[PDB]
Amino acid sequence: IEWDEKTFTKFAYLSDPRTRKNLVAYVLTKANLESNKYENTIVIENLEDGSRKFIEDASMPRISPDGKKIAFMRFEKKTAQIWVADLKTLSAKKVLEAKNIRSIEWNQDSRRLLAVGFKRREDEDFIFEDDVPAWFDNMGFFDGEKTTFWVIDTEGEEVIEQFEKPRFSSGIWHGDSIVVSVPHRDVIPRYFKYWDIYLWKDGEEEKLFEKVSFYAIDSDGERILLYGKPEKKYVSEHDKIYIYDGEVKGILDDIDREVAQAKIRNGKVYFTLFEEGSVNLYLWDGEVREIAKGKHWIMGFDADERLIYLKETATRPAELYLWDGEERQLTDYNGLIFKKLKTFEPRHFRFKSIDLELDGWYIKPEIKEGEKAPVIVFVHGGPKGMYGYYFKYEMQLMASKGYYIVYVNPRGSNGYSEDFALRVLERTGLEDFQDILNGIEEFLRLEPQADRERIGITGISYGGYMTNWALTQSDLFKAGISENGISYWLTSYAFSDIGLWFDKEVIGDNPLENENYRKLSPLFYAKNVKAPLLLIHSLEDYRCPLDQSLMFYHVLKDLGKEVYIAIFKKGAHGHSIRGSPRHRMKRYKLFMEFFERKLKKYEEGFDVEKILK
Amino acid sequence: IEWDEKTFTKFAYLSDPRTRKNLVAYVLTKANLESNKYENTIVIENLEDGSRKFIEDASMPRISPDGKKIAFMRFEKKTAQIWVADLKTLSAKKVLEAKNIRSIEWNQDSRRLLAVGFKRREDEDFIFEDDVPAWFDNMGFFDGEKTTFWVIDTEGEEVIEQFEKPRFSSGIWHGDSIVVSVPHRDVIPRYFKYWDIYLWKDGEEEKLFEKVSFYAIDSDGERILLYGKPEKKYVSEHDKIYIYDGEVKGILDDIDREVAQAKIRNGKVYFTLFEEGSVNLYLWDGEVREIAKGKHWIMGFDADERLIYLKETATRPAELYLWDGEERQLTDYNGLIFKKLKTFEPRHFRFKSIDLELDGWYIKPEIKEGEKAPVIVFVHGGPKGMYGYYFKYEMQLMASKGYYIVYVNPRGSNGYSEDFALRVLERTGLEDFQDILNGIEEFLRLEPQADRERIGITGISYGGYMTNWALTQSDLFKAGISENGISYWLTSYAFSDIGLWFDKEVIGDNPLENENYRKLSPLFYAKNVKAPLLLIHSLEDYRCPLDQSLMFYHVLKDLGKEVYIAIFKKGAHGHSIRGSPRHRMKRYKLFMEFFERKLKKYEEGFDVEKILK
Amino acid sequence: IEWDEKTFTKFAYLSDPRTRKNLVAYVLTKANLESNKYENTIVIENLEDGSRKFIEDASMPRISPDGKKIAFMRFEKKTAQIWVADLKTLSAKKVLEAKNIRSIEWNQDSRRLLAVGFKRREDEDFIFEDDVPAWFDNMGFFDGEKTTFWVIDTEGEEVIEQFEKPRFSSGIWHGDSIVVSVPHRDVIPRYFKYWDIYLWKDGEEEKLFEKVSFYAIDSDGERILLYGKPEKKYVSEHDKIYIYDGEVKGILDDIDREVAQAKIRNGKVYFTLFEEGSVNLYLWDGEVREIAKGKHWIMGFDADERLIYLKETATRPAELYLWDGEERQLTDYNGLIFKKLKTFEPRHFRFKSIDLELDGWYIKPEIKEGEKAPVIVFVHGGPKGMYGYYFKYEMQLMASKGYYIVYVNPRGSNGYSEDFALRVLERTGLEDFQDILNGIEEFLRLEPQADRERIGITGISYGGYMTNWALTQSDLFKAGISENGISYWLTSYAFSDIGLWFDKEVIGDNPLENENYRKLSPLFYAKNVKAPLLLIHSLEDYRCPLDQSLMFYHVLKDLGKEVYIAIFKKGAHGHSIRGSPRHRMKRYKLFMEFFERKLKKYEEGFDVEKILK
Numbered sequence A, B, C: 001i002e003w004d005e006k007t008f009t010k011f012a013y014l015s016d017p018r019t020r021k022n023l024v025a026y027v028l029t030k031a032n033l034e035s036n037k038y039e040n041t042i043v044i045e046n047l048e049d050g051s052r053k054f055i056e057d058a059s060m061p062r063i064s065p066d067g068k069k070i071a072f073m074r075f076e077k078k079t080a081q082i083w084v085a086d087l088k089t090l091s092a093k094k095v096l097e098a099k100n101i102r103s104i105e106w107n108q109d110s111r112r113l114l115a116v117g118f119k120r121r122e123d124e125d126f127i128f129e130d131d132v133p134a135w136f137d138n139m140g141f142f143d144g145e146k147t148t149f150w151v152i153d154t155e156g157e158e159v160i161e162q163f164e165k166p167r168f169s170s171g172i173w174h175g176d177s178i179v180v181s182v183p184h185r186d187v188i189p190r191y192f193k194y195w196d197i198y199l200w201k202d203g204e205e206e207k208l209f210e211k212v213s214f215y216a217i218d219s220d221g222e223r224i225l226l227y228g229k230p231e232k233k234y235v236s237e238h239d240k241i242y243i244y245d246g247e248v249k250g251i252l253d254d255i256d257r258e259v260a261q262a263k264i265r266n267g268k269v270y271f272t273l274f275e276e277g278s279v280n281l282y283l284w285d286g287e288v289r290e291i292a293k294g295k296h297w298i299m300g301f302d303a304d305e306r307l308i309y310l311k312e313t314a315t316r317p318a319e320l321y322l323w324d325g326e327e328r329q330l331t332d333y334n335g336l337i338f339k340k341l342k343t344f345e346p347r348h349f350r351f352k353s354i355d356l357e358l359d360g361w362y363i364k365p366e367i368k369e370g371e372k373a374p375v376i377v378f379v380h381g382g383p384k385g386m387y388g389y390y391f392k393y394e395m396q397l398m399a400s401k402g403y404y405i406v407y408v409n410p411r412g413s414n415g416y417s418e419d420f421a422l423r424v425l426e427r428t429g430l431e432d433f434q435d436i437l438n439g440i441e442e443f444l445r446l447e448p449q450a451d452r453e454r455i456g457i458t459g460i461s462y463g464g465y466m467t468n469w470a471l472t473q474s475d476l477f478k479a480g481i482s483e484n485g486i487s488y489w490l491t492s493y494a495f496s497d498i499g500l501w502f503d504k505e506v507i508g509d510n511p512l513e514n515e516n517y518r519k520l521s522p523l524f525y526a527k528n529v530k531a532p533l534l535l536i537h538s539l540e541d542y543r544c545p546l547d548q549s550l551m552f553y554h555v556l557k558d559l560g561k562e563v564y565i566a567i568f569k570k571g572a573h574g575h576s577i578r579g580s581p582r583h584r585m586k587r588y589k590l591f592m593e594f595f596e597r598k599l600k601k602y603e604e605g606f607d608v609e610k611i612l613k
Ligand SMILES: [Cl-]
Pocket: A154, A155
């Protein structure tokens, strides 16, 4: 095993942990480069033996409350199928052939499933829209989408109740009722901001909440768990969790950090928080108790009789763990790979920027006492993203190729106070960019072997914006790779999936008259660019549509700049990690070669035919 | 036969007339709604009998100079094939299997073909671009495209010479040499503005012209025919024609009208001009002589021993004609259809607008002396398009459904003086929009049965811009249909295929700082809209990309307006006429029903599922 | 070449002669046993050279009036296609893709075609009927069928007018009008008995005739040719022909024979008559003139500038001939085959039966002066069929295998006086059966080498009835082969396609109370059968449905008789001649082996697995 553009295929990727009784289930995913497909296997472990059994070419494991059965999905006919297996022998029957189903959940009776899906107009030749937005990242054109809710009897194998709601509605069981969360409608739907919440049973409903900034995420049959706030002024405010049983009770009213995920089982709540680069696991049982806190990201968890969770670190993809008073590692899927593959632990540093003290990290490559090394600055997305202790392939890969890697959490990031997150609103490219510069300055001080004359910068999404911006506002950088970014806020407002509300918040109100939409946009400062730039974009990214890269590309070419554009024919906003294996391999090889040829040692041109094959 | 959304399928569509000796060849096209395909048949007529023979599932007829053979193209394997047939018996052999060939032309020897095509990078997963623009309407993503030139021996069936040039190059035979026209390169290629022209033979070339605003279109073996000007300041200047034999000689130096098409055969030049709504055919033989001038559009022509041409009118698709001193109609393909299908001849009117007198037309529907009728205003594209005497399906169709149809040639249109065309530059939405208003005002004066309270407006491309604009600047209109339009000039500049140079000319220089890019853009005046609007767009339109409709749609919805968007999944800028038959049928039915339900008699909503099926 | 069950595949089968000017077209059909398909080739002969050209995998040749073009049909998609070719080079275009088209005819303009076809309900799971009958032989279940009429422009390639009529309507051109013949409706449609005739043009019609017993068959643009009678009491009456130009004029009022086919060209009528075993060709030009009269059947003919016809004989399939004052044979397709294959000319004899003198024929096999030979009696269908001088494969084949063949025209047959035909009505199995017995008795007198102890009998349809009947009413016969017959008239009345009207005529009125329906039915006399019988039936025979064979089979088995049944899975009433080649081969081999094993020399059983392979 060596680091290159294919190494990501050698890892086992775990997701969707579930537990009932003495059993754990989860999904093992492999990127198969030869077939160009992801392969999914459900693994069921019996904590009684450490014994494993399998359900092949399947995902979405849902263990029935009684622990007797497992439901799952399989995906010729472009149709999904819901299956049920007995957990003892894993013999299985097909229950329903289920196109456009997004979720499945058991009722407490271990007989009925709730499935939530969607339906669209589906004309062969044209999409027709009369609501907003017209598209959504990783979903496609809405085409008049409505949400569908089906109650499925797994014994008789029939939809026994069904109903529809507006697009982007969700539903959970609450005993024998269904809690339904629907975006609230004003001039447009208030997506990610306000919901109406209903209690549905037997074809009738009652409204529980009107225009609240939380939605229902879980239930234990007596109490409903709510996620968000009673009322947000900004979508960027920290989401919290509340127990509802008649009265709404905050259980983290005093903790100024955002909840990543949360579940309730038997009146206890298990939850994770974004905290200064980590995603940490806690329990609330009347008080908040630490379960798994460290330099790591708790990516998923479940609890029933046992508590299990997936923990990723800066140098290892997720593995599964069990907590019984102390943490026990359950799986070691990548252990043999990693015995042969060098990894680089980031070094944390603090630095001052303006009025704040912030977190940065860096990775130092294998160099000897007399040598200097080039530097890649990475900028995370969001702006309310967060770097720290998750596994970032490009950083390990570039470190292995002789680069320093440097990255910080500027104001606007998740993982800190709410106020720290909100500082970025209407200030994109201002103090946050200064924080990145100040982090780099401190890093250079700490590492005199870092070659100040060969610093590059890269990022995706907000990180792509900031790469664009950096090359227009500073002469520090020798090369840039900007991916799925922003060059012009006004088109983000009006063209992107979330722009109508999110740009109002992050950039400002009255967008057609607000000067900040030009003032804080890289497009308008294109003349300033002096460093070679690679723009990467994908055709199904509706979060940051194509214009954001292609306009910047054309305008930079109109100004005589050295710029290149790679337009991946498939893929949404997250394609760098969710595209097809072969697509992702080609992106990684482009990324590494652009920095080899423009940053480590500049050479003219970029003959992609030669460089890639 | 009745008028509705399918009637366009009942017509025979003729194109690509060719003549050598006593023979005429042309292509008969049918839109087959059931198969959802266009069918192409070459027809060869012998003017000796009016006898016809056929080459089925074929196009691009090219008769050899000696009149003995015909080359043609056919299109399983996504591959084009070049074939040669003997003209006596039409027995035929396949010569070359020819993906991405755009043109075929015989050498004077009746043995060699010149084929011009293209080649691209072709990676399965990503497009890579390092030139400009990254895409072109009706061509796709360039993906590093180069032009390819092949000399093909039709006897031995081999490419005997080949070479490449930059994208958007063209080539013609000139005796045993090839005249090669290549876009001139400054900071970017000067597309539609400057070319370098070379004379190529046997792998060597000499430059004939450098940075000239014409390219080579034809040759008679002694003289080269050039199209354009020696130097244009604006691409919008009238294109003229010149004979080159050592010296460049203008042959229309005194005629202030633009050439539509031109050919040279035996030192005579045949050409058409855009003239006040007509496209008229002339000959130059030392002086300019009228051949076919009237209320018509000469869509294509060829000349050798005989002169033939295709003539379309306001009420008939093209038919073929021969001129031998007087015009004789040769074909009557749609004669039986039109005996059963009512058509409406437009009435021409003049009107004053500001400082000018302009041409308008209108069609009056079957109404009786006591009734009033709604009105649809059509606006042509361009801005240097031209309405008048070609067959416009929607106008006939809507007239048949009880609507007045009104349309003018505002300043900026083709068909008048050069200065009249150039008036629009930096003034889009200003005097030209006034011309449209003044035309409507005169039409209403002329037709008191026209219901001033039910006037709608529609257009495609620049006509879509002007529909957008009209609904933002006037309260006259009750409904709009805007197709493949412009809402924001700055994104047209930076995102569209031609924007980097064409918007500079039509909107203005320094686009990132020029206030006219906001001042003359409908997007910024969305709050003003009061009339229901249907936006139509297609996903392969790179001339006016999607943002132009979808941004306007989202912003109008953000402002609480009644607006709808139809996004056709396939189709370039011209999809209303070049999309698949079923696609076009669905567009026509949407178009007619939106006006039925919003203009003739307003009703709420637009249930496209119900309205269309 | 030898006689056996495959020999029929070695012949060329000609049909559908057409002539315009100096050209003749016709269809050459081959039975391909290996592919199990019929192959059809149009042959065009130029009487100028005896030169031939071809249109492969095509039929229904229709030469345009101007002689410039030929329309034809071709039949993957279960769709028929209408094509047009230039007759000079035979280059061809597809004009219309034409499922369920039954006929095509040119207008006098050589531009428009009239196509007549049908349309049905077409539900995948069930046929639904509310008219009568529910099915028709060689057509299938009607499923609510209506007749469709399309006028097709072959230039523009469009249906320019269309209309529908009740099932079993027909249409011809009459100049620029269409003459439409529709079955007249009383309690049910009066199929084969009364029609209403209309003149149709441009979507309007006028009734020409009401409830008449003729329909329109041809026109020369001035006069309409009508076929039938002004009023028939019996459908079995001889059909005659009449010219209509305002007045209806009989042109064969004095000739007591039935017209087989007739055409009008330039006010002359060419027609054939059924005459004492021959089908003979005449002309009427004011008087009736003999053209081709002899021991033959004129199977088809056409006339324009030249007169051509297909002539079959007892020993040769049809060949083409031209008449220019004398008959010239044009084709000799089977001439080489027949040089090697022995044939047997029938010997005509007269005999007395009751009150009449009748025609019989027999064929004597190669036997020497001391030997006797078995005898097969063949009975033709109808009852108004006719034996004589057409090519009957089974007779030649059995003669070659050492059998006498004997066959007569009993009363009821075509080819004689009308009264002779009508004698059979209400008398089936009575005097007609006596005529067959008396013919056999005279034949035995004429041929003492005919073995009276080994006489068998066979027939199809009415001939199958009479085979059934003979075995129940006589002890003369040693074996029978009854095919697609009648055993019970009452089920013929109520189940068959034509029974509701035809059985009323041939058997009698008031069928539910008329004793003749039992008295003249073989089923009721099954106990009498002593000779082995093979019943052959086919599953798509709606003229004589399955019950007619299977009931007789079951009842004979219930009575302990030696009987066998072969049920061909496909095939209509005429399957012995129109079934697939392999189907027909297997029938011929069954037929010959049953007589070998039951008639020539009786052996027990019939092991069809062994006997056939
Ligand atoms: Cl079950």
